[PDB]
């Protein structure tokens, strides 16, 4: 087309950090074409208290009055079932996010995905409250010499039995395999949802980032800016991710995992911080893929309908009724995104032409 009404757009995997970085990035949610954002909890320290999660959103809302913020707790032994019920009651959180220990940013204070039993009381409460369980689905890497090797290329596949058990022990709970990167994970999600037909049946879904629809291992091998977790994988994996994203199936929907880092935390000779920054042009990135796939008819489901449906986003929570309007005027992605002070971020696909822009119209 040349103008597409995406309605209330949906980015269900957002990192905005804190401090000067957050002031720079949260207004970019709306700027990249996103009305509703699900905010991830891996701050330093993690978000595990009620007052933190409440004030964090107030800080966010002040920065972005027209952005709807859905919040989350960082899965943790700190949490209690009481904190869960007390938070779902006051509608302070809409889900809880699990980070396996060591596999990504600010995950050191994370959990071990081999003994999930210690958190079954937490999922117990979460299920009763219809809260979402978000999973960074990678097993930690394993050296040893006895048990089968786990590395960055198969850590997501090795996590897939854990996902299935969690689904089989909490069958009413809403679970999301965040940012899928492998054909194996796509196939697992499609099998778990084999008998779904419309749509509110889905209880296990997967988010797909913008960058994993573009990247393979070649793009990050000598390019830390394209390094994130889970890493982009083989060409066959990308094909499956793209096919899923444009499939029109209600169990795949957009989650950017926009993960902002100052440029000096990417230009390291060791300990490069994982993460791609896509917030500034979130929807235009996804538009490009759907255009090239001749499937622009499925864009609205992927970037709006399916996440709204799965998260059950009701009209009474949306901060602004403005519609996101995609229109086919080319823009150039800048080389850097700066706050004029101490923050420079390199955006995903810095310097590239995008065919689409996005603006806001009232309902």
Point out the annotated binding site for Zn(2+). 13, 15, 97, 136, 179, 257
138 binding Zn ion? (CB under 5 A): no
Residues near 44 by Cβ (< 8 Å), separated by ≥ 6?
Answer: 106
The 10 Å CB-count burial string (b at 16+, else e) for 293-311 is eebbebbbbbbbbbbbbbb
**Residue 257's binding partner out of a copy of itself, Zn ion, none, with CB under 5 to 8 Å set by partner kind:** Zn ion
Select 136 or 139, whichever has its Cβ closest to Zn ion: 136
Calculate the CA 162 to chain-centre distance: 19
Q: Which of 17, 94, 139, 266 is in the footprint of a copy of itself by CB under 8 A?
A: 266
346 binding a copy of itself? (CB under 8 A): yes
**Residue 217's binding partner out of a copy of itself, Zn ion, none, with CB under 5 to 8 Å set by partner kind:** a copy of itself
235-245 vs 183-192: helix axis angle to the nearest 10? Answer: 30
Q: How far is the CB of 179 from Zn ion (least distance, A)?
A: 6
257 binding Zn ion? (CB under 5 A): yes
Token pair listed for 119? 């958190």
Select 33 or 347, whichever has its Cβ closest to a copy of itself: 347
Q: Which of 30, 94, 136, 349 is in the footprint of Zn ion by CB under 5 A?
A: 136
d(CA 272, CA 59): 28
d(CA 219, CA 141): 22
Residues 147-176 binding a copy of itself (CB under 8 A) are: 149, 151-153
The 10 Å CB-count burial string (b at 16+, else e) for 230-248 is bbbbeeebbebbbebbbbe
d(CA 117, CA 99): 15
How many residues bind to Zn ion according to rule CB under 5 A?
Answer: 2
Select 214 or 302, whichever has its Cβ closest to a copy of itself: 214
Q: How far is the CB of 222 from a copy of itself (least distance, A)?
A: 4
Task: Tell me if 319 sits within 8 A of 27, measured CB to CB.
Answer: no
Q: Which of 87, 96, 173, 274 is in the footprint of a copy of itself by CB under 8 A?
A: 274
| Chain residues that interact with a copy of itself, rule: CB under 8 A | 141, 143-144, 149, 151-153, 216-218, 221-227, 231, 234-236, 263, 266-274, 346
């Amino acid at each position: 087309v040349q103008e597409i009404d995406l309605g209330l757009t949906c980015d269900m995997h957002v990192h905005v950090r804190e401090g000067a970085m957050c002031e720079l990035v949260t207004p970019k949610i709306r700027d990249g074409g996103v009305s509703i954002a699900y905010i991830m909890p891996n701050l330093q320290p993690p978000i595990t208290t009620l007052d933190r999660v409440i004030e964090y959103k107030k800080t966010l809302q002040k920065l972005a009055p027209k952005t709807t913020f859905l919040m989350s707790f960082y899965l943790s032994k700190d949490l209690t079932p009481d904190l869960i019920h007390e938070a779902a009651q006051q509608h302070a959180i809409r889900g809880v996010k699990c980070y396996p220990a060591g596999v990504t940013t600010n995950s050191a204070a994370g959990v071990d995905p081999n003994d999930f039993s210690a958190f079954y009381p937490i999922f117990k409460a979460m299920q009763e409250e219809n809260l979402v369980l978000n999973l960074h689905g990678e097993k930690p890497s394993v050296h040893d010499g006895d048990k089968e090797p786990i590395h960055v290329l198969n850590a997501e596949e090795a996590f897939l039995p854990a996902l299935k058990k969690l689904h089989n022990d909490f069958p009413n709970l809403k679970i999301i395999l965040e940012h899928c990167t492998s054909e194996s994970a796509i196939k697992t999600i499609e099998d778990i949802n084999k008998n779904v037909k419309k749509a509110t049946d889905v209880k296990v879904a997967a988010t797909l980032t913008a960058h994993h629809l573009f990247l393979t291992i070649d793009d990050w091998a000598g390019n830390p800016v394209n390094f994130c977790k889970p890493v982009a994988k083989l060409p066959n994996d990308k094909k499956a991710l793209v096919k899923a994203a444009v499939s029109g199936k209600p169990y795949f929907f957009f989650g950017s995992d926009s993960a902002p880092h100052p440029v000096q935390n990417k230009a390291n000779y060791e300990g490069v911080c994982a993460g791609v920054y896509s917030q500034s042009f979130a929807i235009p990135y996804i538009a490009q893929v759907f255009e090239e796939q001749n499937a622009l008819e499925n864009l609205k489901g992927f970037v709006s309908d399916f996440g709204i449906s799965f998260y059950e986003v009701k009209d009474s929570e949306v901060a602004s009724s403005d519609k996101a309007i995609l229109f086919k005027k080319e823009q150039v992605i800048p080389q850097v995104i700066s706050d004029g002070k101490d923050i420079s971020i390199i955006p995903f696909k810095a310097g590239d032409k995008l065919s689409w822009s996005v603006r806001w119209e009232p309902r």
